[PDB]
Each structure stands twice: as structure tokens, then as C-alpha cells.
Nucleic acid binder design. Structure first.
Lengths: 56, 123, 137, 84, 97
RNA sequence: CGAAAGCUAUUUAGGUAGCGCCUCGGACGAAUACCAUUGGGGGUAGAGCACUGUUUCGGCACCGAUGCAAACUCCGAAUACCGAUGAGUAAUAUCCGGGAGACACACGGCGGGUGCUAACGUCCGUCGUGGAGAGGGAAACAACCCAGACCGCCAGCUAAGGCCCCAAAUUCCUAGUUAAGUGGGAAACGAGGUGGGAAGGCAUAGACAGCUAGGAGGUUGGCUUAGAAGCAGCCAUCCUUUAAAGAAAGCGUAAUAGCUCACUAGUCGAGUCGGCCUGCGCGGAAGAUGUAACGG
RNA sequence: CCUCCUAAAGAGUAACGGAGGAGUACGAAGGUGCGCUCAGAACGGUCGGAAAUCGUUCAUAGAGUAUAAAGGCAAAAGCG
RNA sequence: CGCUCAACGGAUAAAAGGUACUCUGGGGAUAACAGGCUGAUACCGCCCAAGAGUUCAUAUCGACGGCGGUGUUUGGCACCUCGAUGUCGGCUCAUCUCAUCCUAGGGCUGAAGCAGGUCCUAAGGGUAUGGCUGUUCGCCAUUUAAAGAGGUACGCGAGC
RNA sequence: GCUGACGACCAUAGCACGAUGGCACCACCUGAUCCCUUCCCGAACUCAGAAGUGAAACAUCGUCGCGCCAAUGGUAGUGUGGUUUCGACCAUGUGAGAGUAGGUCAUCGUCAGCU
């Protein structure tokens, strides 16, 4: 199964590992929405940056 | 009390009539909890040694000496706040007057003697 | 003027005062306590003034406990000395007070003349305080 | 300089770092000769597969995986190399 | 005087954040343990608990907790207060056999 | 494409050099990063007195209560760091070589030393921004907040921040608080501001206040003191007639005297009294060219 | 140059920050084999005591470790 | 094997000072003035009330302690200025603050009156001349209703 | 069923108190010729032995007096994001130490011997 993740806030001034969680999710800019498999490993990346992304 | 002032130092002598009770040295053991400078207070100000600011051209000698006598008065008042009794100010006329316009309780002063000799080394 | 008789070391790092008094927040020996609601440093001079003003008001018919002991040396730099060139000398001693700590306990006296002495002491202290009873839990 | 309290208590010396500590942790592959712990005294003791230097350095005597344990009646910390 | 009313404290009301929320709703967390059975998490209204703590035999007598249903005969074992404010923060009751 | 103001050394300290960081070329190809699960060691935050010290009280150095510590630890996280396994995402990591620049950094956070838990202070660690970064907000304002400018558009949605007028957008809706222009500087402390909360005391056997009458005898309690009479201070605080009245809560006297109060009865008729907790207010609150401490 | 702390539980990490050491010693104080266990406290005992040596009973180290501190040390690394 | 080459990555085998007679290249990377930040200290105010005051804490004063305000002393920092921001004092000419020296209105008083003391309101005007010393100040003489405390680059040298 | 040896483990295994054990085993025990011991000493070590005793020790069993172990709940701290009056607070994840209830007089393995 997959899920939709959208970037809502800038990733530009965040921690290095938070920028890397955005990169590992595949999110590149504000309002960008990607489809990614809904696994615990991708859910952990969403949880690392959950303040700046939202899951539809 | 007898507060002795010079431009380089202050002494404090406790007295009863003709005799000196104590002279307030480091061995007095009433200066132990002093927060101000204890007696004898040497004037080790910045202008007396040379580090400072505002070298001689500023003509701040009077202001520096006024503040030194203000700190001397602080020490005298600290020692008086436990054993209140009047003070006699001894020293040059200029020093006595600089002290007078700086003293915290100027109405406690009973006398000012300006013709006492050998104020630094004297008995 | 309380002070440790002798210390392991002369000088101390500033440290931080954080957190509540989970220890020493109970009236342990007396029947009536004055406890601090704020934090800060309690100078040995403040402790001595407060003890004097409680002792005078209770007049040798009651017992006092001082729960604070000043064991932290505080260094000071004299006037007209630049920054650096070594840590200043110790000038006075404080106790670290957290919100909640009992400072004074009284026992063996009426509630009214204990509250008066405790209010008198609070007036000399750098803390917001409250008067507390001894409960059992 | 009033109160003259500028008292010189001169102590500004310190030694160079020694870089002690655990070099290889538990479950890591290790080859013989690899230093595991640098230490003063036996904060860790040498169990099977690890040797002890004149400096109390612990090193792998043979290949395998590093294992940490608390063993013995002194409840000592032990480092072993398991053949795995 | 020796009777108090409680409400079951669920597993979603447990922990630091949920405890702070529970005290913001004017409830005191408490635990009943001992006796024979497993510990039970309960909540007591703070005003009721303060009034009960006012009485001095409360700390030495057999108390009865009624958790909206089941009954528990207990003894107050521990009481956690705020270090500065002084109000009760937690209560520990032990079942009597 | 894109730094650095670091480490090490230096007759070095504003110079230089190796390393770190930038660029270009080649080699290599996931060896890299993020996350999930998982294997480790630790002595920090917290905590605590088991050691080293330090602290208080009681009993009799030891016992029992009770505190504290960078150079104390019977304990002890979160993180971080070192490994493993596994997905997906990704302009990865590493090595060899050509060319550098840089080795004055600054602020805002966080953890500290120093200082005064002073400094737009200083010294480290660690993050972000500036440096080398425009745009929007914070009146104005490198370093704060939001956000990273390839160029053009008289299109749309939003962020921080905003929506009465300057000035784009609510004189929007609901429930309440404030009366201080508080909002739109400032503490201990003071006060009968006002709103809310959890409880109490008293009351038609008449509460609270007011008003009328009493408020007494032993007795000037004893001691002290020059005095010492309810009322300087110290030790008691007892009895009697009672409806009630203190060996007195104030004023007053040199001490007395005197005037009150507590308290009781009468009058009056319905609620009232005092503490605690929370919200928002008040006083405390004085400076120099001009209001001048909401930008107006 | 060494030890502790600052140093933020891996390493490292500055200050004219807080405290202390070194510029040696040893042919045994090195190697090995074998053997041993300390400080204290109390009781008894000639001179002899607070404390000498002797005996007993407790004693995981409250000792020692050439030397500062830290870490360690019973298989003692301590003592023959 | 020979270095306290100890300034310990060790410049030479071999080495001190003066300069107000000075000079060059630079720095506001770094001091002295003045500004700025801070406010320990200082000054001013407030809180408590042991006490002093014949009695009597609070007329007046306020021990031990606590809390602010100012920028105002002595300092701390090194942000501005070193391709130059002239120091102290006087003279001249000022301008503002109020923490008020006089004059004005008040409360309290240990206010009989006269004089005061303390505090509140109040900044409209006013607020000396000499001796000494470069002084600012200070002492002193003689006055005055009074002879204020301060800020203004410790106001003012392209005005002296 | 018990004893001994060697281990695992290293207090829930320890300490203390009491009880049981001598046919095997173990320990004391006897003697010091011999081997070997003592800076003196057959104490320890060593040898040669069984007249005696389970006294000591040791082993086993019992108990909660100490020790040790130890929840649940709460509190403290804390990573990330936000806010702040700088104390803290909120969202989320994590989560002690102390203390309390409670638990504990261990649990196993190889080999030999007597029954």
C-alpha cells in the first residue's frame, strides 16, 4: 500500500537529518506531493518531519 | 571614632577620652564581615598607580579623591552601624571638606581637626 | 554568619538553579514553616538577619530550625579590575533556594506569635514566601 | 583596584588528550590485532579471544565478533571475541 | 469522612502528558494496589481529596473508594504534593485484606 | 559551481605552511545519506548520600531524622556516537590528480566556564541566520520570524504577519474579562478594585453593623522598678457575682485618673463574616532639544 | 610534559578558568617459580605509655602500590 | 655519546638598553577624550522595624536585612572615530530637567508665638562679591529672600 | 537419598540464628622414622597412618532479623516542533532516581563413590 505526502513548510532551514528525511521521502519543494509506500520505514521519515509535511 | 584622612590613605581609631581603644587594623576582629574596604584603607586607585583612563590632562584628581573619600566613608559607616558613636574627622582642610560633602551621615560628625601632624605614620 | 568550617575546594563554578525543591519542602522538625515560592540565592547575611528577627519575636520560649546552610562560595571582582587574570576571591556564602524549600521552622509557641515571627523574617529575605503547617502526608 | 583582591593563584596547566575509550563495540566484526579498548587499569578485563597490553590495552587475539559481558564474582566487565 | 469517590483512569489518561491534562481537568491521579489483586488506576476530584486530607483520621483509618461501581477498602499509603503550591498531585492507596 | 574566518605549527599571533572546507578532471559505483528494527559501551540531565567532604536537630564518635557538592557517586536517562539487517527515496560516499581561496568572523538559540546567570562582554561546545542572500513581516532594524530572486506577465493560492483610517483585507460571529488608555516599560511590598472557584463560621432559639444599658468584686495578681495599679518588662492568667466582662485588645498617666474595646442584655429585622485559590486591573512609577514608553 | 575538572554519558574541545605533579628512581624496585595478605578496633600481657614488640577476636582493603592524581589491582598489579 | 637548544618544531656558534631630538609604513584589528552597551559600584527612592527619641518604632532618625529607579560617581567592555571627533579651568553666550535653594500653596509635628523640622504640590521668575590656588572643587571673609542639584561632546577654542 | 571434584551463574546465590549428618565421603585427629617443611615453631606445608569425634569446620534443612532484588502509578529530566514572563508551558516521542506494594534462605551441568 501507498500514501500521499505533501510538503507544507520550507525545508530550507531545518536540521540536516530533517532535510535528509525530506529527501528520502522524495519531497523537493513546498506543496510538492509524492506517492510513497506506507511502510514503517517511510512512516518514520514522515514522523521525523511531521511538523512540515502532511499525509493525505 | 577618629577618621584620619590623607590623599593616600585612611585610618580609623576608636577612642575614649584621652586614650585609644582600638586602631582598626587587620587584627581588630571587628572588620571580619566588612563588605567595604577594611582599615587602613590605602588609596590604590587607578590614577595613583597609572593603569586607569583619562590621564593627567583630564584633571580628574579631585573627582577621584572625592570618590576615594566616599569609599572611606562607606567603610566608616559600615563599622559605625554596629557600634554607633560620633566621629571626629582629622586631616587636611581640603580632605575634611571633600569628606564632608560625601559623608552618608554628616550630622554624626562632632568635630573636624585640620592641624594634626604626621597623619600617615603617626601614633 | 554561617559558613562551612572548611571546604574541599576554595572556589566554585557558577552552576544553575533549576527545578523545584522536592527535598526540603516539608516541615520536618518544627510545627510551623516559612517556605519559599521563588528561587534564588540566600546569603548568609540574610540568614543571620532573619534568624535574629525570629529569635527576638519568639523570646526564648520556642525552638527554631534553620533549614538552609550557605555552603556555596561566591567570588567577586573588586572595582577597577579588568576582565580575566584569574577568578576573583571569595567574598560571601550563599545557599541555593528552589521554589518549595523550607527555610525556617518554629515549634513550641502559639500559632499567632509564630506567624508574626515568620512574617518578620520574610520581610528580610529575597524571596516570595508562604507560611506552611506540618501535615503528615 | 580597591580591595586589592586581584590575588594570583596560578594554575593554568593541563595535559594533552590520551584518546582512551572503547574503540570497537559489541557485535562488530574484528580481526586479530585490532585494539578494542584503550584504558587506564582494567576497566574492562580480557575474556576469551582478547589479550591485554602493558598499557592495559585490549586487543583481539583472533578474528570474529566483539562481545561485552559482566561475568565472575567481582561483577567485572569483560570483553571477548566470539568466533562468529 | 472515610469514603471517597473515584473514576477509572484509562490507559490513555496515563503518562506525563495525559497526567498533566488530567490535573488541568481538576482530577488527581491515584493508584490502588496491594491486597490480593492487580493495581487499579483511578482519578479523584481534587476538591474532594483536599477536603478528605483536611481530616486527620483519614491518614490512619480504613478508607472506602467507590469507583463508579466496584468498591475497594484501602489505606492511603502515599501522597504526592506540589513542592511549592502544596496541592495534592498523586495518591497511593493499599487494599486492606 | 561555490567556501573559510577552524585544527596543528610557527621570533607565531592582522604573515605563512600541512590538514579541513571550494572548484575542475579522471577512477570507482552504492561502499553514502535518511528511516524502521536491532547489537553495544558510557557516567552527563535528573537524582542520591553508599564513598570523599560539608549541614542542621534530637538521643547517647555512633544511632535516628534532615539538607548540599565542578575536581563526591550506591544510581542514572533522553539524545549523541560505533555496528548490523532491511525497504524506498536521492545530482551519494570514496580515491588519484590540476587550480584555489581561507586560517579578524558576528548575532540569535541551547549547554557551560569567566563576569555581576552585567554588557551589542569574553572563552569553548552545538544549531540556525548573516557573512556570501534579495523578497514579505518585526514602524525604521546584517544576525529575529516566514521564505531561498533564471527572465517576462495589469493571472491565481497561500506563509509569517495581518484585516477602523493612514494602508491591502472583518467597524466579522459567539462567550466572557478590563475601566486602568491597563492594553501601549519597571520590583519588593501595600490596598475594602473587580470577576470566578473550592470550602468554612454565624443566623427568625434574631446573625453582621449601628444605637441604648452594663463592662464588675478579690485586686494596685505576684515580681520588678524611681513608678509598674488591665495596658515598660518578666512569671501566672485564678476565683467570685453573673446575662456578661480579659489578671485586658487599644488610647491615655510619672504612676494614678480617664476614654474605649472584647463580652452580655435591649432595639432592629435577613442574610451576613472571615481566610484560601485563580483571572484581569490599582498604587509603588523622578531627567534632562519636543508630545516622545501603541509608528501615527 | 603528566593527572583531575571545565568537557554538554564515544573521541576531541578554549580562557591571564579551578586544583595538583614532572625534567626522576631501580641490576632489583626487572624475569620466573613458589609462598603470603593489609589498615584499624577491642581484650590479655615485664619495663611499655595514646601508640613499639607478643597473643586472641572481628576486619574486601576503611591498607599498600618508589613518586602527583585518576583509573586499577585477590589469578592480587600489594608483601616475602 | 655531547643541548634548562626550558621561548622546550629547537632563526646564529656568537647579542643589552635609550629616544621628550626623533622618523617611516600601518590600525579605531588596539589604548588615552568624548559617544554607545552595562550598571557591579555610586547617587536617589521604597519595604521591614531592632532601636534612639524622658514616655513613645514610625515628630524626627532608622541597626540587621530586602526591593527598585536614575545614568549620576568609580568602573567593566572595545561597537564608532587613528587618510586627526583639540585636553582641564576661566570668559562670553546659553538651553533643558526636577531629585526645589528662595519666593507660592499644603498635611504632620516632640506645631504656644517667633522660628523651624519632615513630607506633599509646584520649574513662573530669581538664585552674590571677594582672598588663596591653573583649578573645577574646597577653605575662608562679607553679604543675600536664596547663594539649588544636575543634563547639554564632564554645553560652548572654525566665539575668546 | 547423600557425599566429593570441576564448572555455569555471581546475593532472589549473601549474612545471621537454630536443627540434622559419620555406614561411604569429608573434616578434624595420631606420630614426626622417612620425603618435604619453619627467617623460630609438624601452626601452615609434607609424609606415614587409623585409637577417637562430628566439638570446630563443612554439607543439608528451616526462617524474613539484616542484606539483596523489586513493581504499578506518579514525579524529575529529555529528542523534535511550537510558545514563553526565561521559571517554564503545550504537541509528540521517551522516561528515571528515590520511595511504596511485593519477592528471596537460589537455580542448573559433567564425572565419580555409598545407599
Amino acid at each position: 500500500k501507498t500514501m500521499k505526502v505533501t510538503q507544507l513548510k520550507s525545508g530550507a532551514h531545518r536540521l540536516k537529518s530533517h532535510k535528509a528525511s525530506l529527501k528520502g521521502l522524495g519531497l523537493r519543494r513546498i506543496n510538492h506531493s509524492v506517492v510513497v509506500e506506507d511502510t514503517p520505514s517511510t512512516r518514520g521519515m514522515v514522523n521525523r518531519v511531521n511538523y512540515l509535511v502532511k499525509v493525505e | 571614632y577618629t577618621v584620619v584622612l590623607t590623599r593616600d590613605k585612611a585610618r580609623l581609631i576608636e577612642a575614649a577620652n584621652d586614650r585609644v581603644v582600638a586602631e582598626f587594623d587587620t587584627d581588630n576582629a571587628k572588620q571580619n564581615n566588612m563588605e567595604g574596604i577594611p582599615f587602613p584603607i590605602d588609596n590604590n586607585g587607578l590614577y595613583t598607580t597609572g593603569d586607569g583612563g583619562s590621564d593627567r590632562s583630564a584633571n580628574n584628581e579631585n573627582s577621584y579623591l572625592k570618590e576615594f573619600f566616599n569609599q572611606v566613608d562607606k567603610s566608616v559607616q559600615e563599622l559605625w552601624g554596629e557600634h554607633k558613636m560620633p566621629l571626629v574627622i582629622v586631616g587636611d582642610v581640603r580632605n575634611i571638606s571633600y569628606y564632608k560633602e560625601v559623608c552618608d551621615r554628616p550630622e554624626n560628625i562632632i568635630a573636624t581637626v585640620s592641624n594634626l601632624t604626621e597623619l600617615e605614620d603617626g601614633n | 554568619m554561617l559558613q562551612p568550617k572548611r571546604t574541599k575546594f576554595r572556589k566554585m563554578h557558577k552552576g544553575r538553579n533549576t527545578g523545584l525543591a522536592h527535598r526540603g519542602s516539608t516541615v520536618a522538625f518544627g510545627q510551623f514553616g516559612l517556605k519559599s515560592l521563588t528561587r534564588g540565592r540566600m546569603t548568609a547575611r540574610q540568614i543571620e538577619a532573619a534568624r535574629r528577627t525570629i529569635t527576638r519575636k519568639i523570646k526564648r520560649g520556642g525552638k527554631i530550625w534553620i533549614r538552609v546552610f550557605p555552603d556555596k562560595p561566591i567570588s567577586n571582582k573588586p572595582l577597577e579590575v579588568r576582565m580575566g587574570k584569574g577568578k576573583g576571591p571569595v567574598e560571601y556564602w550563599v545557599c541555593e533556594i528552589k521554589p518549595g524549600k523550607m527555610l525556617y521552622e518554629l515549634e513550641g509557641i502559639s500559632e499567632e506569635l509564630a506567624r508574626e515571627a515568620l512574617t518578620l523574617a520574610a520581610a528580610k529575605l529575597p524571596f516570595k514566601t508562604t507560611i506552611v503547617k506540618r501535615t503528615i502526608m | 583596584a580597591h580591595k586589592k583582591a586581584a590575588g594570583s593563584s596560578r594554575n593554568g596547566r593541563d595535559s594533552n588528550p590520551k584518546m582512551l575509550g572503547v574503540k570497537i563495540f559489541g557485535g562488530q566484526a574484528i580481526v586479530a590485532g585490532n585494539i578494542i579498548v584503550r584504558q587506564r587499569g582494567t576497566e574492562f578485563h580480557a575474556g576469551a579471544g582478547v589479550g591485554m597490553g602493558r598499557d592495559h590495552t585490549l586487543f583481539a587475539l583472533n578474528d570474529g565478533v566483539v562481545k561485552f559481558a559482566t561475568k565472575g564474582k567481582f561483577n567485572r566487565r569483560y570483553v571477548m571475541v566470539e568466533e562468529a | 469522612h472515610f469514603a471517597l469517590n473515584a473514576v477509572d483512569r484509562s490507559a490513555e489518561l496515563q503518562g506525563k502528558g495525559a497526567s498533566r491534562r488530567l490535573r488541568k481537568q481538576n482530577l488527581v491521579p491515584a493508584i490502588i494496589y496491594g491486597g490480593n489483586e492487580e493495581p487499579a488506576s483511578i482519578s479523584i476530584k481534587i476538591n474532594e481529596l483536599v477536603k478528605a486530607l483536611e481530616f486527620e483520621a483519614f491518614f490512619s483509618h480504613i478508607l472506602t473508594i467507590t469507583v463508579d461501581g466496584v468498591e475497594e477498602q484501602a489505606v492511603i499509603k502515599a501522597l504526592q504534593r506540589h513542592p511549592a503550591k502544596g496541592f495534592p498531585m498523586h495518591a497511593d492507596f493499599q487494599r486492606i485484606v
